[PDB]
């Protein structure tokens, strides 16, 4: 079967066949679309099919499908599963798998870059201190003094589900948030619960507005342990504006390295519960969401005040005006400091070129419109006008619940 | 089977039960989401009639009453004999209001119960259609104090006697492909303009020419009529700070009036049912003015602002966008023509959603359409999970008549 998507700006029509390979579910049915819903131990029997599906894809990609090497590898994995109840990936399969999880990530606008991913194999890791060391090396490699490089570090896979490796941080680098007795928040309200956990575990909180959180690291199902990332490894950018000299006195800064640490990587049925990955920022992630969400730093008012916009009625579009100036500031700042960043116009244009390429060479590109369209200036970006099909391919990145909700505390 | 939606800004969680009453299919499956796709006999009619009359009688708290059982009887009888039936005025009004209530793509539904319904089922000719439509335009416009209205022409019979307004909106601007290669006017309307010229319209060949109505009665060939110019309220666009903005020569019309959709009520199909509200400012300033395939004015504006257009990262597009949208709102407000900004409209929709969840058990909403085309995440709807599903009565897309009509 063939599904078509149309671009309503260019009238380019594309044909998807790749969707024939999805099997996981969307949340939607013939009666209800859940496209805007944020969140819509295995057995041997389920495992070998998943392994086989993956190895068939891997061997096809290297043009060795049905070779002796492919067949010997299937037999080898089959025997390993029946005997040990799991299997180990070869390094080449791990690299291919991690790259494909990114390629398959339907909410990711930056996927043009998918084939350029540095994979660090941390499956020999055994302790939280070992995890800390791997993560520092990742951060230093990825940061590359501002010339950012995409990377992923993969810790040992799930076994019985009682021995999981987890990074409790949602990102490797993030700022603390402190709920005050008066109900106000100091720092980032997104990270209050995690900050309280760090404090409880013994972190000495500086109690400022941009305090880089400590890593909380769990190895082999053990209780997690705290570590401070060496400050010299954490690249930060002070935010200033090209024309507005008072912008700097808002005291804003942000970190250069976006590094997701709380997702689960599935490759061939295996589950990598600690797999931190990092790329570089699109400016709106900081300028629109991190700074301007009401539930985050919430700076729109102070910026509009300083700009002397008419704030008595929403129809002056003062919020819209201040929003643009903040985003100019973020891009100007990163560029001035030679820290990699991409604007939402460039990133969405590259994404459309990536998407069209994927259609031609792969037969599709699953994409989640709700997430791909930037949170400002939506229809002046080409993705707004692009119909997309969202479906689930593996290898994949998945949400997993926060570990403080599920961890069995040892003592 | 019972579904939750969460607002990620306020943590408020609502429970949807209304989706179980959903009837038509979404386009999505368990394997694939089509949420971003623009367009994903007798024996059939009585179930549809019954479904509607049950909800109607429930709505006036008379469910299972003799008057309810009598009406079902009467309609059953009428379909049996005539192959169709006719709605009571009370039913027609209820159906139309509810079609708006059910429109998952409409942010303005807080207004749904204040809809003036003009019953034009007694209309028989295109000249009659023109009269009804001028009356709708004048009533809805109300000298700038806009009032929502719908005018309902006779229902489909055998499908060869359809009433249709050929225009996509009652008021729109012509588009002309030029020898030059460019497009003069609105590129959205090039094909319809040609059909108008072909059917005899003498086009002025300007940038903002109000199209004539092309009206089809009783499945007859469509006829042309010009809307009295004095009934078409238009707004010249100026900016509160940039005096040069008026020199761009921009204007828009006050009355957004959709005329190409089909109203389905209790299985009956009303193929000509033009309806109108008032504008949200972004519809004109972001989409009509800035879409690359519409008036595409960003470059010109940015050039007059003297912005650095060298690199996308200066955000010159974003800067010019905000200014254009400021000018749209200021112009409408200064001329006292009703308009809503996207902040006000989306705040109102959140309130409406909470009302509908509390009073009705849900509100079908299409996030892709509801979130405005600029400044998405600074409006509350961005952070609001929504469920999309199809309830009847409904407004539906139907194919353009020139593909379907046999001359
Ligand atoms: C190279 C530069 C990259 C850019 C500019 C980029 C851009 C983005 C943006 C803007 C989002 C949505 C984030 C949000 O709104 O919270 C996102 C999501 C995502 N990206 Fe990327 N990305 C990049 C690299 C990567 C890499 C290296 C990976 C994994 C190897 C990745 C995988 C993902 C995943 C799984 C999501 C969805 C996350 C979720 O559901 O919370 N991306 N990307
Ligand atoms: C009173 C003020 C109203 C406001 C502010 C408003 C707002 C909007 C907006 C902004 C859109 C999206 C339009 C687009 O992006 O092309 C829309 C769509 C829609 N509205 Fe409304 N609306 C109003 C009145 C009405 C009325 C009176 C009806 C019917 C009686 C209606 C039914 C619809 C329908 C069916 C759609 C989707 C049309 C389509 O799919 O193309 N609305 N509304
Ligand atoms: C509950 C829930 C599920 C789910 N899938 N996502 C969320 C919220 O998303 C948090 C976002 C995703 C992460 O950033 C995206 C990103 C990742 C990368 C690798 C690069 C980049 N520029 N941007 C951090 N914030 C919440
Ligand atoms: C009643 C009303 C009020 C208001 N403020 N705005 C509107 C705007 O809707 C008018 C038209 C109808 C919409 O058409 C877009 C469209 C195109 C196609 C091909 C299909 C479809 N369902 N919808 C957008 N403009 C309508
Ligand atoms: C409810 C809704 O799905 C939610 O607010 C989404 C919308 N789109 C998004 N898009 C991106 N890129 N990131 C997000 O966090 C969200 N949040
Ligand atoms: C492909 C995509 O569905 C399309 O561009 C949509 C997105 N959201 C929209 N939203 C509104 N309100 N109006 C539109 O015309 C569109 N177009
Ligand atoms: Zn869907």
The overall number of domains of chain A is: 3
The CATH architecture classification of the largest domain in chain A is Alpha-Beta Complex
Question: Largest sheet of chain A, described in full?
Answer: 4 strands, mixed
The most extensive interface, with participating residues per chain, is: A-B, 65 and 64 residues
Structural class of chain A: alpha+beta
Which oligomeric state applies?
homodimer
- Cα separation of the termini of chain A: 55 Å
Q: Could you spell the SSE succession of chain A in H and E letters?
A: EEHHHEHEEEEHEEEEEEEEEHHHEHHE
Strand content range of chain A: 5-15%
Ligands, ions, cofactors: protoporphyrin IX containing FE, ligand QJ8, 5,6,7,8-tetrahydrobiopterin, zinc ion
CATH-level-4 superfamily name of the largest domain in chain A: Nitric Oxide Synthase, Chain A, domain 1
Radius of gyration over C-alpha positions of chain A, nearest whole angstrom: 23 Å
Widest sheet of chain A: strand order? 3-4-15-12
Q: Specify the overall morphology of chain A.
A: globular
Named CATH topology of the largest domain in chain A:
Nitric Oxide Synthase, Chain A, domain 1
Quick one: how many beta strands of chain A?
18
**CATH class of the largest domain in chain A, please?**
Alpha Beta
* Helical proportion of chain A, percent range: 25-40%
Alpha plus pi helix count of chain A:
10
